[PDB]
């Protein structure tokens, strides 16, 4: 009833911190994002994750990064973690150069595409928009 | 056999279609909350408890500000999507 955490390594943690975007994308500077990143870098570190941060990644960069990570050997890891901080829309996140489907980023870790993470939690924390709707609250 | 899509967890900052707020000085609401909770219970609560406490913190201890009446006093609720098959604790 519990994921076995008995490994020598809790796992890897990829924090992608996109602050600046290409003037073509039209998106503006996500101020305070560096504060989130550093804040996250400590929490996930304290938890036991071997975290690494990447800034203003291109969509390709984000793909290669997650692709490669998935191709890493997670035999001695309990789980895997990935944090994406950026601009986003429904089903997608922004790279400094554009938008890329979240599915593609995550698909790389499917059981049939990363054996060493099979039956081990694959965590994705995503801070970004998912549309343009607003919640006006109540009472 | 295991479902190729099993054991994944997506912790979004907002629900589908909606906006996600971020204070330029203190950082986004979701991350502020996720950190304050992980920093106090990351090692004693199951992942879903952690993320549920984060949901409540982003829903109650936050409210947008803007000199634009259309973006004034807005709210936000994170969104957790679990395909996990076990309880997750970052310890032991």
């Amino acid at each position: 009833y519990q994921y076995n955490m008995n490994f020598e390594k809790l796992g890897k943690c990829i924090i992608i911190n996109n602050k600046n975007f290409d003037k073509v994308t039209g998106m503006g500077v996500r101020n305070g994002t560096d504060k989130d990143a550093e804040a996250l870098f400590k929490c996930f570190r304290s938890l036991g994750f071997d975290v690494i941060v990447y800034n203003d990644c291109s969509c390709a960069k984000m793909q290669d990064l997650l692709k490669k990570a998935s191709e890493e050997d997670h035999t001695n890891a309990a789980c895997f973690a990935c944090i994406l901080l950026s601009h986003g829309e429904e089903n997608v996140i922004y790279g400094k150069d554009g938008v890329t489907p979240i599915k593609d980023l995550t698909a790389h870790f499917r059981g049939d595409r990363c054996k060493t993470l099979l039956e081990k939690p694959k965590l994705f924390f995503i801070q970004a928009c998912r549309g343009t709707e607003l919640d006006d609250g109540i009472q | 056999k295991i479902p190729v899509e099993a054991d994944f967890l997506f912790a979004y900052s907002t629900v589908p279609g909606y906006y996600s707020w971020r204070s330029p000085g203190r950082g986004s609401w979701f991350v502020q909350a996720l950190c304050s909770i992980l920093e106090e219970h990351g090692k004693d609560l199951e992942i879903m408890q952690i993320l549920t406490r984060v949901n409540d913190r982003v829903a109650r201890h936050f409210e947008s500000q803007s000199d634009d009446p259309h973006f004034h006093e807005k709210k936000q609720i994170p969104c957790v999507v679990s395909m996990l098959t076990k309880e997750l604790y970052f310890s032991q």
């Binding site: 503006g28 996500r30 101020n31 305070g32 950026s86 601009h87 986003g88 801070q127 970004a128 928009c129 | 900052s13 906006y19 996600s20 707020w21 971020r22 204070s23 330029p24 986004s28 947008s64 500000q65 803007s66 973006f71």
Partner: peptide, 4 residues
């Protein structure tokens, strides 16, 4: 506040 800003929007993401």
């Amino acid at each position: 506040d800003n929007l993401x």
